[PDB]
Amino acid sequence: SDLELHPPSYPWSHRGLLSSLDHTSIRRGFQVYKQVCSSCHSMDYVAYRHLVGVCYTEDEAKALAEEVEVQDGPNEDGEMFMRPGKLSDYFPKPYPNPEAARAANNGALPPDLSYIVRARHGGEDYVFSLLTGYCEPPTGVSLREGLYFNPYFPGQAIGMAPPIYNEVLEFDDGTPATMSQVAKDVCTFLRWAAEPEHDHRKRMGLKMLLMMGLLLPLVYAMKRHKWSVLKSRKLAYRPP
Amino acid sequence: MFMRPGKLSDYFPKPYPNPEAARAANNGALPPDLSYIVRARHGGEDYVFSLLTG
Amino acid sequence: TFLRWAAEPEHDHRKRMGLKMLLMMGLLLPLVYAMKRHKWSVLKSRKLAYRPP
Amino acid sequence: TNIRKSHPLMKIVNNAFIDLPAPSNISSWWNFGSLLGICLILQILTGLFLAMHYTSDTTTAFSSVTHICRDVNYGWIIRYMHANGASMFFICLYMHVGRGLYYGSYTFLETWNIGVILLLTVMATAFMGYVLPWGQMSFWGATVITNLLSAIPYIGTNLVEWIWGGFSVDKATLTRFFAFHFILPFIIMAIAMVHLLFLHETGSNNPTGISSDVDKIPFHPYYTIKDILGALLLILALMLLVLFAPDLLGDPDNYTPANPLNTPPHIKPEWYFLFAYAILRSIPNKLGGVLALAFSILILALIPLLHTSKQRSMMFRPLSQCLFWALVADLLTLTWIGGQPVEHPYITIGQLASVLYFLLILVLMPTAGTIENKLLKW
Amino acid sequence: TNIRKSHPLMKIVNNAFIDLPAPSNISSWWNFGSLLGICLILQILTGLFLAMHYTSDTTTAFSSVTHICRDVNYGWIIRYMHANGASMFFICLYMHVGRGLYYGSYTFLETWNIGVILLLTVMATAFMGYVLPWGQMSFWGATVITNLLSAIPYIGTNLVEWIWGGFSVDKATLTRFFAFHFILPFIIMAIAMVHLLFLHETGSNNPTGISSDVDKIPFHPYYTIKDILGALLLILALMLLVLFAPDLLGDPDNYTPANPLNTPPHIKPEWYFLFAYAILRSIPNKLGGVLALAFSILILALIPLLHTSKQRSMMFRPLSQCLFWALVADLLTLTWIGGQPVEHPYITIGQLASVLYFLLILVLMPTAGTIENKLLKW
Amino acid sequence: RQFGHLTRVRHVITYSLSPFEQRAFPHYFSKGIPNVLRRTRACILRVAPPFVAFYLVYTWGTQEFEKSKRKNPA
Amino acid sequence: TLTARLYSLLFRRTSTFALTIVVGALFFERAFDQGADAIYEHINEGKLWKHIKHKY
Amino acid sequence: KGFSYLVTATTTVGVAYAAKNVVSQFVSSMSASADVLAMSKIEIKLSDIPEGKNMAFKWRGKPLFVRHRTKKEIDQEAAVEVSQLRDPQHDLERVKKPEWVILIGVCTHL
Amino acid sequence: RYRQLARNWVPTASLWGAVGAVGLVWATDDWVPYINGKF
């Protein structure tokens, strides 16, 4: 409690200044959210459309949308119905409110995952080392039950059961579904979910650095030119 | 969700849960909300009075 | 009557203020008007004389 | 020596409003400038208060306004003030422009064109403000009017959709109109600063139209008292509306929330745009109607070049005076027509009024200037 | 003759920014004034764009901002710019104030006190802007800070509740903070106009501290080029953050919606207020801490009277230079402390840093001025 | 330009009186009513004619709208 | 010198100096975009959707 | 002169590029958001509507009618009165398929 | 005579008209090769 273990720094394929997200890794990581996390955890800020051009073709995304049941607004009778999802629907809330979520999780509310990378210090490093960090308590530690030991969490007692282990799911691409591999992929997706802009921003960064490489010596040269009149000048005092 | 008795703090209740429900119940016509009705019809009280008695 | 009140709860307060506004303006309009005339009296009264040699 | 004359900030205020040589003989018609300033301050204050309570989401917006009127302390008086305020502003504006035309104040070109821009800018402001409550008129008004820019060939459709930020006037349009409506009065204040800056180069015109340097008087106290008197009268008027007749100048459909499925029986904008609505409605063709609507306003900018009289002011110009009042009455008629449904006889009254309007400004009053000149042997 | 010198509007711009006699020798430290202007324009533009998309209802607000970042075209870059923009503004502000202190620019009293007000006004602005997203920090930050006004005896409780418009920071507070945050930059622009107006009475100081009338140079083109160069460097910096490190200067708790039931582990305001947070936190007593926080800022206003040196600028004042940099480092320390939880050793580091701060301004640097005077036989 | 070099005036005498020496409303009705009549007679034939015509075009056209909305026997 | 050729051809007349700059910005925009883009997309080989999209 | 003005000309080009970018970005910010484009278009399955029967849908928040038309409807709407209509428009140019008429389900009147 | 014996702004306003044409076409974004000719 009130101790440390701050995450180490894993060499993500997107750590580098000009390095984009691995989009194949995002695709796998989505799968990890879909099959594992989405039972407990919402992600209210992603819609099926957002996967298009990122990790899924347009109709692939449509397939994924059609797979879910969503409520739709009042019909003729003034009744609510269910339908298949479209691209336009946001990824569905696993419970109809937070209190319902709590009842289902021994009184703990699972955070929405939209921003989770962004709203926890350490981001991907934190979350990765969380999922892969579960260990048996040290000698002398006894946790209230249904709260698990994890050295990377504040206080070390987390109300989340270790959600991740080998072959916990099947990969579209068929990548070896080892525990560490699935924690990487889900983290990659969780970064993208928190910051869709990651790649565009990094592209612009490059173009900004380039333009500034041009413009900074250029304007600096303009400055020196004008000021050369003054820099060169020699003064002479000549009283009679 | 539960039901309870109203308090002072509750707004006067909607007779149906949406407009489409209201329509079904009124041969396809939607009864206007009455909050502003005096204000949102030319003639105000004179209009509405002569409507009800007309 | 209820439908008027529902549309405009303020009906009575507004009408009270109307009265107080009319009253204050009854005071203030001739008052300030009098102030105006006073200052301007210098100018209103003045007589002009052209007197070339 | 004396602070009012030296201190960098006080100097300006002194030069502007205390020791400014004003003509002896400016009439009540010169009150309007100060009054417009008041209008502007009034809107900003009442506006600011409203904006502490209002929301610009389609779903919350109509009710947030009524919430001001029911549950916010004195929210009602503030709201009705800002609304009647907008009317008082346009009255002041049209009176002010009237004086410009009749007394030949428009000879002050820079002052004048700034003024035209002030007018346009206040117009934009009030157009977008009227949308903010999200009533039936607000919505259908804003839809029809913005759609006119669709008649622009090549780019019309794209341009209107970019303003909207979608395929109709919807969530994105309201939120941006809130933004624009907030910042525009600020820009109006600066333009008005400049408006004055140029006026202060020439000093004021007067009703004779004849130079008044031989009979100027210090602004304070003559015109300080007189502006105050005028402001009282403006307040008398404003509050008469707010406290006795708050809805007199508005449309009731604006108490019925905006509904994209049910179009109101007669769609009109606010009264202060009715003359221009009626000109627009007179033209069969839609781009024609647009260009007429624009010209009904922008023509203001041309009036300086259309001046023929050897005398500046209409005081001594009987024929011109008659024509001036003709134009005024015609604008009353254009307003009547613009509030009317498109049926006989109004279609034809409107067409005539529209012809008369442009005819007066571009042909009749120029001519009259000249006839008068000949009557005077120059 | 020449338009730039005559025309009422151009004259001002000429006098202000083209033909203004500037000292030959002003350093990079005089860049900050222009840069602050840029900061201000930058915030207004990016701000205006954001405001076309944002809503100030507790329920919609957090998501409307994220909507800008997900679904509005380029909304992300705009938003991050306005946020890093706010940091760049405070950097420019603290650099600018630094130069004031070191070079004795504060002898220009009117200019200087206006400046203090600019600082306060920008502070208010950024405080209220940070609330607008309605994150965990936004909310709990705004709560703690506004609550300090509760420590005002007699009226404290009432006063804080009136600001809020209720019994906690809630719906009414956010909507009004949106309003205030919008109009304040406008008022900052005017105050800044005035800030310059007074500066233009004296012209600029320079690093020697010695009058420079014998060696002035026309502003354009020497300082036009040089300000541009500076603005590039500001842009380089701003965009480095936005495009490489957009979250570097912020707190992650501000990605977690505001929740009145769960208080964050460490509550801090933005970094640009940390020195003052740490001074406040040093005092046991709550009204004590308030008055210290206020004094840590308002003391700026007194520094003119605390000047002892016979020389204006610190250029030739070694002892004073050391003390100046001591103050700077101390403020770095106060910032560190203010970002830290209230535990050993930080409680005591903070207390010391707080003492050191006031000690330097009110006793040490006055003294040093005087010691230096004696070292020079005056 | 400010008071001091506005223009050049020669040979003109201005006599006036303190406000505190004088009535605010000298002969307000006895001079003022006649003056107002004089003022109105002067302008009404320029100003009133248009508004008469407005009232008429509005009277007529309002009632032409009335008539056309009725039925006629045919 | 090259610069001499440029001065007399493009830069002496201010109308021409402007025409130069608009036209050159045109070709610079296209060139710089295309080149920097290729620089980024080689630095990030394999990782972009546009690199993997052939699979779906 | 050439050299020193080259620097100037170069400089301006770079700034123009950057400025173009800054500006046009701000501009697209005002054009419809991705979420408003996601409601741009609506897909309808034609094999899921029967012959003669109307089927309503929701479009830009408004009713949107598609109708499968019989050869009765097609021929009876083919040779109606060319000119005499209130709003003169023939049928082979209100539609793109003879047997499919698509219409927004809002009365033009009120 | 002497205005008309101006008309020396005709070749300069020719070059300013190309600046206006090419400028509006750059700011707004086929038959110019390379630039946009290859989208």
Ligand SMILES: CCCCCCCC/C=C/CCCCCCCC(=O)O[C@H](COC(=O)CCCCCCCCCCC)COP(=O)(O)OCCN
């Ligand atoms: C896009 C903008 C379009 C163009 C703008 C049109 C402006 C709209 C008009 C508003 C009224 C403007 C007032 C004009 C200046 C007044 C001139 C005036 O007072 O003339 C009077 C007669 O007064 C009188 O008889 C005064 C009676 C005032 C009449 C009320 C006006 C009706 C409002 C109509 C609203 C649509 C004679 O005065 P002078 O020649 O100065 O002589 C004084 C005595 N020697």
Ligand SMILES: CCCCCCCC/C=C/CCCCCCCC(=O)O[C@H](COC(=O)CCCCCCCCCCC)COP(=O)(O)OCCN
């Ligand atoms: C409520 C407000 C509170 C009070 C305000 C405090 C201000 C915060 C401080 C920011 C930095 C201000 C800069 C002060 C003026 C700079 C003076 C200066 O450049 O001095 C240099 C040494 O420079 C150098 O060595 C330049 C190095 C610059 C150091 C970076 C500063 C660190 C930032 C800390 C942030 C919290 C010597 O220059 P001169 O005496 O002019 O002599 C020149 C050569 N003859």
Ligand code: HEC
């Ligand atoms: C229900 C059995 C869960 C499944 C399946 C997953 N998670 Fe979870 N998670 C759950 C609860 C009840 C909580 C709250 C924990 C607490 O101590 O109160 C959580 C929390 C997280 C966190 C937050 C860590 C922090 O610092 O707060 C993360 C990053 C998280 N969960 C991630 C996650 C991922 C990636 C999952 C699928 C791979 C996943 N969770 C499944 C309950 C449940």
Ligand code: HEM
């Ligand atoms: C020229 C100045 C202004 C004019 C002409 C003006 C005009 C209008 C108009 C016509 C309305 C519709 C009023 C109604 O019928 O409900 C309105 C509403 C509003 N205005 Fe303004 N306004 C101005 C300045 C401002 C300013 C500066 C603000 C805020 C900073 C503001 C905030 C509002 C708000 C919140 C509403 C919605 C509430 C309401 O409808 O009353 N206004 N404005």
Ligand code: HEM
């Ligand atoms: C916000 C709107 C406006 C404000 C605040 C404003 C303000 C003022 C002020 C204070 C004056 C001097 C006082 C006066 O002579 O009445 C004035 C004069 C003037 N204004 Fe305006 N004005 C506005 C709009 C306009 C418009 C729309 C026009 C013309 C289309 C205009 C043209 C003039 C002219 C010509 C004068 C000089 C009058 C004279 O000296 O005879 N103004 N204005």
Ligand code: HEM
């Ligand atoms: C001194 C000038 C200004 C400063 C220092 C400033 C500062 C801030 C700050 C610190 C935030 C929080 C940013 C964040 O972390 O999300 C913010 C948000 C915001 N500001 Fe400003 N602002 C300024 C001017 C303006 C203006 C003039 C407007 C609008 C007219 C505006 C509109 C907004 C809006 C809508 C937000 C919410 C969106 C967001 O959080 O990014 N700002 N401002």
Ligand code: HEM
């Ligand atoms: C929005 C914030 C501000 C803006 C836009 C601003 C603007 C400017 C500008 C343009 C200059 C002239 C250029 C320069 O010498 O750097 C200047 C100078 C000055 N400002 Fe500020 N300023 C601001 C805040 C402040 C503050 C907070 C202070 C003091 C607390 C201050 C005190 C001064 C002083 C003393 C000078 C004269 C410097 C000299 O000539 O040596 N200003 N300001």
Ligand SMILES: CCCCCCCCCCCCO[C@@H]1O[C@H](CO)[C@@H](O[C@H]2O[C@H](CO)[C@@H](O)[C@H](O)[C@H]2O)[C@H](O)[C@H]1O
């Ligand atoms: C005076 C002749 C005797 C027989 C008719 C007696 C009725 C009174 C005279 C008016 C007759 C109505 O006939 C006419 O109808 C049209 C259609 O609405 C209207 O007139 C208008 O028509 C269209 C309206 O879209 C416009 O293009 C046209 O420019 C305009 O004149 C007038 O109302 C009237 O000119």
Ligand SMILES: CCCCCCCCCCCCO[C@@H]1O[C@H](CO)[C@@H](O[C@H]2O[C@H](CO)[C@@H](O)[C@H](O)[C@H]2O)[C@H](O)[C@H]1O
């Ligand atoms: C040096 C003596 C040998 C024995 C102690 C060795 C430990 C190192 C020295 C510091 C001892 C800690 O004891 C002390 O604890 C308090 C409580 O948090 C902190 O000190 C603080 O106490 C409260 C905090 O609310 C403040 O009112 C007080 O002004 C301040 O000094 C310091 O951390 C430390 O002065």
Ligand SMILES: CC1=NC2=C(COCC2)C(=O)[C@@H]1c1ccc(Oc2ccc(OC(F)(F)F)cc2)cc1
């Ligand atoms: C200067 C001026 N010259 C003349 C006349 C009359 O003719 C002669 C010249 C005037 O009537 C006036 C005038 C103008 C405004 C005013 O009161 C204000 C001030 C400021 C204000 O807010 C604002 F935003 F505009 F700044 C609102 C009202 C008082 C007097």
Ligand SMILES: CC1=NC2=C(COCC2)C(=O)[C@@H]1c1ccc(Oc2ccc(OC(F)(F)F)cc2)cc1
């Ligand atoms: C006047 C001035 N005197 C001096 C120095 C340097 O010391 C000598 C005196 C300056 O650097 C400057 C200066 C100040 C601002 C500026 O660029 C602007 C202008 C306007 C602007 O928007 C605003 F809202 F403020 F109006 C934003 C930036 C350029 C130059």
Ligand code: FES
């Ligand atoms: S006939 Fe359909 S709304 Fe009038």
